[PDB]
Copies of this chain bind each other. A is one copy, B any other.
Amino acid sequence: GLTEEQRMMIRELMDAQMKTFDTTFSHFKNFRLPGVSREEAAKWSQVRKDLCSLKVSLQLRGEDGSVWNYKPPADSGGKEIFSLLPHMADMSTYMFKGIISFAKVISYFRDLPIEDQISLLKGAAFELCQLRFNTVFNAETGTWECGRLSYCLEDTAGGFQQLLLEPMLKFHYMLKKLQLHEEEYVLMQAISLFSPDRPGVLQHRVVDQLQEQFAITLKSYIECNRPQPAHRFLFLKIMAMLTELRSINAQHTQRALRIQDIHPFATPLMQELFGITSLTERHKILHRLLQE
Contacts and interface: CB of A to CB of B under 8 A. Distances in A.
B65 A80 contact: yes
Q: Chain B CB within 10 Å — which of A36, A76, A78, A83 has the most?
A: A36
Contacts of A94: none
Interface residues of A, number: 21
Interface stretch (A4-12, A67-75, A194-202): A67-75
A83 B64 contact: yes
A66 B56 CA distance: 12
Contact of A64 (B60, B62, B67, B76): B76
Interface in A27-69: 33-36, 60, 62, 64-69
Contacts of A71: 66-67, 69
Nearest to A80: B64
Nearest to A34: B66
Contacts of A66: 34, 70-73, 80, 83
Contact of A69 (B68, B78, B83): B68
Contacts of A36: 33, 60, 62, 68
A69 B72 contact: no
Contacts of A64: 73, 76, 78, 80, 83
A62 B35 contact: yes
A68 B70 contact: yes
8 contacts: A62-B73, A64-B73, A65-B74, A66-B70, A66-B73, A66-B83, A68-B68, A69-B71
